[PDB]
Ligand binder design. Structure first.
Ligand SMILES: [Zn+2]
Lengths: 49, 107, 52, 62, 84, 50, 154
RNA sequence: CGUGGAGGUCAGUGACGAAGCCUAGACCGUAAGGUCGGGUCGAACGGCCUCUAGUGCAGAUCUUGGUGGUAGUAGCAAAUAUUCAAAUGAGAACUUUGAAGACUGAAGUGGGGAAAGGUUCCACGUCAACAGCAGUUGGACGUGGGUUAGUCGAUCCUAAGA
RNA sequence: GAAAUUGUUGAAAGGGAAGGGCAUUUGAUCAGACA
């Protein structure tokens, strides 16, 4: 008996794009929220005479 | 082409001024560059019984002279670059200072 | 809508910073927090003279 | 292979710590099927897994 | 420090889950939910919190009984067996 | 904690069973515009404040 | 796929392409420009020499504050480097284009790399964390590469 | 002069290509602008007489989004330290095993717990993203398994209190 | 499937900026033919 190759040819082609869709929504959530990430009210500066 | 011979490497003039955390890790690379020009091929493998003889007294505290026997063996695999390789193993002698380089007879 | 544009709870940050003095959506943790609100030049604000 | 679980199971089986467990380097292909603790005990009795000796701390100078 | 060293001691809760609204608003020392006083018979709702009444008004949930009253009114609260 | 209550364990069970990817046959339906589980959550990124 | 401005004929050419590759665009542009116009075998020996750390890649546009070297003297420039990731990603496409040319039936003795360009790809955001509690960006610049090898005519 | 809609009219234009967009191609107007040719494109849109307005932007430390130079630059320098061989793999400074060298040195870099976390525990498969180098590894990714009480706690009692 | 911004190809210019106004040479391109 012999049949060597066995792996999925559609379940990886449907994961290689749902992964990049998840990554794209993550990136467009990062860059549409990364304007006022550094807004710190009541930030006092440790600089004086 | 398959030759094998013994050398004395003066590691004192190679590990001069080197930091104390790098004396024995430099000594490994100096033995590799020694065997890269004596029987001058790349792919030089050391022995583990050579590594633990370099490293016998810590990082700092490599001995002043080592007595090696470098064997240019022929590569048993396909090896489609430099089909020869050196193999460096120590010679257990007491007081390894005072010996010339000699060619050991193949057997 | 008479409540369009004004369903925000925003107030300006004032001077002492380096941003314009438009009312800004307070809070955190979302993309809306910090954005300029309540204006007519803003995005999400009421129009100039909302039609009655 | 990956014998990081076999060394842990051998430490728990022999009862000595993980720094005293010796797995045979020429028999990793046999050690890799030892997923049970029963197979670890079989390898211990077979001599593939050996407990290493305690490092000596002498009290002679004391 | 009153910023990063004093955020390390934040490890015991002052609000837990309420039973009437399920959100983490039930104060534990004073025993009153701050989003809809749980002990009180009436749910908290203020006319200045007109956005916060939208999140808790009628229609935000299942409306298990109330979604059928218009269908029953349209037929006139009829009872009995339907037809042949 | 290790000594939790049943009200907390009953919510941790739901948060465990809600933490899975989207089923693969959902994407084969006709007017299906649900591409990935957009309410996914793990313990590294966001805490569930219960 | 649609390629760049290629003034060749399709009967004698063979192309290769890679998109969204995570090599840096600034290094991969100099790697792709160093072999522009060369013979295929000469470029494939040259990039192997770069990886063996002889015969550096001349950096010409994106080269501010990089170090000077003695291996730029064959190109006239004084600033040059040996980008290993960029050389490996270009070498994979050179091998793929040589394979496509051999499948089309062009003779590999007169293949020269005519058109070769890189473009930027979408960036890939990731955070770095700075002093006084403020996030910045720390992102990669991926690159599309495309390549055409054609056989030399009269 | 130009824009979004409305009432008339051209029995107006259009899948034999409407609108849009590009065009150191052409024409008209002092100008606002208008017209034509070419490429792209794919479903609707104009001329004139009037009506109506959420009707013309270079600025407001303007709002939102997107992108640059700086710039392959600053840097990735605390916690003494790594080295050899083999295995696996397409690929090993970083995984695994063996050999060395060292470190925490019993107020530990050890063995448990309380808060807090919530499945991170454990196995198999995997490496697109994450692990500010890498990765064959992982507290990641995918699939599953796992927590057993008459005696341990809660439950019971009361404290300051509510 | 616009712009900022970028790659390749082609043309041109370039002694401590670049851009613009008037005029003409030179290169490209267009014009009508008075048919
Ligand atoms: Zn409540």
């Amino acid at each position: 008996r012999s049949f060597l190759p066995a792996f999925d040819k559609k379940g990886v082609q449907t994961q290689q794009r749902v992964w990049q869709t998840e990554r794209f929504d993550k990136k467009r959530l990062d860059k549409r929220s990364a304007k006022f990430v550094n807004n710190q009210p009541h930030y006092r500066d440790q600089l004086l005479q | 082409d398959v030759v094998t011979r013994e050398y004395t490497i003066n590691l004192h003039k190679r590990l001069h001024g080197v930091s104390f955390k790098k004396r024995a890790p430099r000594a490994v690379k100096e033995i590799k560059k020694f065997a890269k020009l004596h029987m001058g091929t790349d792919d030089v493998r050391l022995a583990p019984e050579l590594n633990q003889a370099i490293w016998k007294r810590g990082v700092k505290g490599v001995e002043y002279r080592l007595r090696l026997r470098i064997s240019r063996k022929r590569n048993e695999e396909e090896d489609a670059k430099n089909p020869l390789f050196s193999y460096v193993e120590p010679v257990l002698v007491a007081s390894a200072k005072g010996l010339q380089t000699v060619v050991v007879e193949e057997d | 809508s008479e409540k369009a544009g004004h369903q925000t709870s925003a107030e300006s940050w004032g001077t002492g910073r380096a941003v314009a003095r438009i009312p800004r959506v307070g809070g955190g943790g979302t993309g809306r927090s910090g954005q300029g609100a309540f204006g007519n030049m803003c995005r999400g604000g009421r129009m100039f003279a909302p039609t009655k | 292979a990956n014998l990081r679980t076999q060394k842990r199971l051998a430490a728990s089986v022999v009862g000595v710590g993980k720094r005293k467990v010796w797995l045979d380097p020429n028999e990793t292909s046999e050690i890799a099927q030892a997923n049970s603790r029963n197979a670890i005990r079989k390898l211990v009795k077979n001599g593939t897994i050996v407990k290493k000796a305690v490092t000596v701390h002498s009290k002679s100078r004391t | 420090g009153k910023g990063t060293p004093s955020f390390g001691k934040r490890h015991n809760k002052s609000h837990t889950l309420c039973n009437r609204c399920g959100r983490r608003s039930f104060h534990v020392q004073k025993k009153t939910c701050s989003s809809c006083g749980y002990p009180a018979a009436k749910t908290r709702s203020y006319n200045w919190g007109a956005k916060a009444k939208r999140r808790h008004t009628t229609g935000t949930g299942r409306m298990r009984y109330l979604k059928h009253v218009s269908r029953r009114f349209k037929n006139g609260f009829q009872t009995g067996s339907a037809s042949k | 904690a290790a000594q939790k209550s049943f009200r907390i364990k009953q919510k941790m069970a739901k948060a465990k069973k809600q933490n899975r990817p989207l089923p693969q046959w959902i994407r084969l339906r006709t007017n299906n515009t649900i591409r990935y589980n957009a309410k996914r959550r793990n313990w590294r990124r966001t805490k569930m404040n219960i | 796929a649609r390629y760049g401005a290629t003034s060749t004929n399709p009967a004698k050419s063979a192309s290769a392409r890679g998109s969204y590759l995570r090599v840096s665009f600034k290094n991969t542009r100099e790697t792709a420009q160093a072999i522009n116009g060369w013979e295929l075998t000469k470029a494939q020996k040259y990039l192997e020499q770069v990886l063996d750390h002889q015969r550096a890649i001349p950096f010409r546009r994106f080269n501010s504050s990089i170090g000077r070297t003695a291996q730029g003297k064959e190109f006239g420039v004084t600033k040059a480097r040996w980008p290993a990731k960029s050389v490996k990603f270009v070498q994979g496409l050179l091998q793929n284009a040589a394979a496509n040319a051999e499948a089309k039936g062009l003779d590999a003795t007169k293949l020269y790399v005519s058109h070769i360009q890189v473009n930027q790809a979408p960036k890939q955001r990731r955070r770095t964390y700075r002093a006084h509690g403020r996030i910045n960006k720390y992102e990669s610049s991926p690159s599309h590469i495309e390549l055409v090898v054609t056989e030399k005519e009269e």
